[PDB]
Curated annotation (Swiss-Prot):
Protein name, as recorded: Protease 2A
Reaction catalyzed: Selective cleavage of Tyr-|-Gly bond in the picornavirus polyprotein
Residues binding Zn(2+) 1: C50, C52, C110, H112
UniProt lineage: Viruses, Riboviria, Orthornavirae, Pisuviricota, Pisoniviricetes
Subunit structure comment from the entry: Homodimer.
Catalytic residue positions: H15, D33, C104
Protein source organism: Coxsackievirus A16 (strain G-10)
Function recorded in the entry: Cysteine protease that cleaves viral polyprotein and specific host proteins. It is responsible for the autocatalytic cleavage between the P1 and P2 regions, which is the first cleavage occurring in the polyprotein. Also cleaves the host translation initiation factor EIF4G1, in order to shut down the capped cellular mRNA translation. Inhibits the host nucleus-cytoplasm protein and RNA trafficking by cleaving host members of the nuclear pores. Counteracts stress granule formation probably by antagonizing its assembly or promoting its dissassembly.
């Protein structure tokens, strides 16, 4: 679990969105595993606007913050699950690092701010949904 709080937006994995999130929907994209809902309180996060390939992410299944090198956002095939059939997930970045299904929502940060959130994983791999291209999160 986990979410990003920027201005009056809450960014969550779409598969973990609540019914309140859906009632207050701003934007969602199933192919990205993202959903953004509106908030009443202002959050304390800043979104990175950069092409960084290094950073640190939080791993709940280890209670640890790990430094990582990660790939560029791309279309990556993700196996079928209880939330989606097998498909290409877009804007995904992979890294060698520990993850388990419950780690989704863990934030990845670089020196410029929030880069994305854990969305996928594998045997010694972790995948992050990028948020740096969503320029509108910084305004309106
Ligand atoms: C001190 O946190 C970090 C430091 C470096 C890099 C990453 C983090 C994680 C982070 O930003 N978290 C943990 C977070 C989560 N959902 O992963 C809950 C809220 C909070 C905003
Ligand atoms: C962090 O996730 C894992 C880590 C290790 C092993 C397996 C997983 C699970 C995983 O990849 N997904 C993909 C996710 C999606 N974005 O389509 C929905 C289902 C499930 C939460
Ligand atoms: Zn950066």
């Amino acid at each position: 679990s986990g979410a990003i709080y920027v201005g009056n937006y809450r960014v969550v994995n779409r598969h973990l969105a609540t019914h309140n999130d859906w009632a207050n929907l701003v934007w969602e994209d199933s192919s990205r595993d993202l959903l953004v809902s509106s908030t009443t309180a202002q959050g304390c996060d800043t979104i990175a606007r950069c092409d960084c390939q290094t950073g640190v992410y939080y791993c709940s299944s280890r209670r640890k913050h790990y430094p990582v090198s990660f790939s560029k956002p791309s279309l990556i095939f993700v196996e079928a699950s209880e939330y989606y059939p097998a498909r290409y997930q877009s804007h995904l970045m992979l890294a060698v690092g520990h993850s388990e299904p419950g780690d989704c929502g863990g934030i990845l940060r670089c020196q410029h701010g929030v880069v994305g959130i854990v969305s996928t994983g594998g045997n010694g791999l972790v995948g992050f949904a990028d948020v740096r291209d969503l320029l509108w999160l910084d305004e309106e």
